[PDB]
Design a protein around this ligand. Sequence first.
Ligand SMILES: [Ca+2]
Ligand SMILES: [Ca+2]
Ligand SMILES: [Ca+2]
Ligand SMILES: [Ca+2]
Ligand SMILES: [Ca+2]
Ligand SMILES: [Cl-]
Ligand code: NA
Ligand code: NA
Ligand code: NA
Ligand code: NA
Ligand code: NA
Ligand code: NA
Ligand code: NA
Ligand code: NA
Lengths: 222, 224
Amino acid sequence: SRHVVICGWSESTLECLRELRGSEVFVLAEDENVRKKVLRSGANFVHGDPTRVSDLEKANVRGARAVIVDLESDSETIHCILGIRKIDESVRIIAEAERYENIEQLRMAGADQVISPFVISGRLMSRSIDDGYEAMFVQDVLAEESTRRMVEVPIPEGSKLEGVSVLDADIHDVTGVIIIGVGRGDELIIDPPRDYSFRAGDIILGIGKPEEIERLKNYISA
Amino acid sequence: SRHVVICGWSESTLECLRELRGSEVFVLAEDENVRKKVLRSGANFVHGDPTRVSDLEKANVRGARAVIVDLESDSETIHCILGIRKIDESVRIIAEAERYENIEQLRMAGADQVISPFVISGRLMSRSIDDGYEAMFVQDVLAEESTRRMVEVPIPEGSKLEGVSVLDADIHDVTGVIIIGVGRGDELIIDPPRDYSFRAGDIILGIGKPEEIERLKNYISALV
Ligand SMILES: [Ca+2]
Ligand SMILES: [Ca+2]
Ligand SMILES: [Ca+2]
Ligand SMILES: [Ca+2]
Ligand SMILES: [Ca+2]
Ligand SMILES: [Cl-]
Ligand code: NA
Ligand code: NA
Ligand code: NA
Ligand code: NA
Ligand code: NA
Ligand code: NA
Ligand code: NA
Ligand code: NA
C-alpha cells in the first residue's frame, strides 16, 4: 500500500501517527526539534515548509495515497492545500480547520475532507452538562483499544446482500453489529430507512465486537 | 434550572455557546474586548482571570450546574479546576485538554470529564485515508441540521422496560431508534449485549428521526 504524507506537526498529527503505526508515513514539517519524536512514532521526517511546492515534492505527494494537512493557521493550511493541488489534482486531501468560518475555504482550495476539532469539541461540551455519555461514546469508539470498534465493511460484488433491504438484512440480529450508516462515494446515509436496498460497492458503517465484525464480513460475502 | 459557567474564550467555547442559546450562561475570561461577542451569543460576561478563586466566585460557580473549562494552556486549565474544587467539591466540571500528556492530570485535578479535540481529530484523520464516513458520521450527528438527532433518553421509574433485556426490548425494531449505548452513573455501555437488563435511571443513547424518538419515548414510558 502507498505512503501517506502528513503536513505540519501538531497534537492532532501526533495522534494520527500513533494510529498509523505499520503504514509508511512521511511527516513534512518546519520545526526541526520534533524529528526524534516523529521517528520514534514510526514515521519518516522531512524538514520543510509544507506551503512551498518544492518541499511538498520532497515528501513525494504524487505517489502518496493521501495527504493529511494541519498547519498552525488556516491560512497556512490553505496555502499547503493549494500547493498540493499544483502537483497532484486528484490525490485525497484531509485537512484540519482551526476556525469554523474557514471550513468552506479549505474545501474550496481542494480538501476532500475537513475535520473541525473545535467544532466537535464545543458541541460535545454542550451535550455534557448533565452527563458525558455522548462525549464518552465518540471518544471510546474511535479508540482502537476498546471492546467496541467502529468499522467500514464493503459489500463485495456478488454479495448475498445485493438488493436486500436493510429490514430484510436484519444485520444486528444476524451478526451483532449495529448499522449506523451506509455510504457510497462521498455520501453517507445515517440510520438508513427500512426500505433502502444494498448494492455492491455500498459501505456499511457499523459498531461491534471484534468477533461480530468477522461475522458480518462472512455474512455479506459471496 | 441553574446557570452554566464557561471559563475561557476559544473556538470551542464559542461553538459551545451556540448550542446553549436559551440557557443561562456565564462566560468568565481575561480579555475584556470579547464582551460584545459574548453578549451577542446569548451569554453573560464576567471579566476576570478564571485561575483566581475570587474571579470564579463572581461567576457564581457554587450555584452552577456545570462548569466548562478551556484555557489557553493545560497548565492554566488545571489551576482553574483546582480553584473551582476549592469552592465546590461536587460541581460537574468539563474541561478541554490541549495536550495528550496532560489528560490524566486534568482528571487528577478534578475534571469530571475531559474532551480531547486533538485526539478525536487525529483519530478521524487516520480513519479518513480511504474514505471519510467516520468523520462524516461524527460531524453529521453533532450538527443539529439533518433529519437524524442523537438523543439521551432516561428510563423512567416504573417503565415497561424495567428488568427487560435489550434482546426482549428490541428497541430499534419497535421504534426505529438505533441504540448505540446505555449509560448509568459514570459508565457507558456501547452496543450492549442481548442479555443486559434495563434499570430505572439508565440513560438510553440513541439515533433516530424525531418521529422515531417520540415512538421511543412512549415505548419506555411507565406502566400503570
Ligand atoms: Ca491543529
Ligand atoms: Ca453487538
Ligand atoms: Ca481550546
Ligand atoms: Ca475510514
Ligand atoms: Ca431509524
Ligand atoms: Cl530532511
Ligand atoms: Na512505518
Ligand atoms: Na497520486
Ligand atoms: Na429480527
Ligand atoms: Na442565555
Ligand atoms: Na453547589
Ligand atoms: Na429483533
Ligand atoms: Na419493526
Ligand atoms: Na423485526
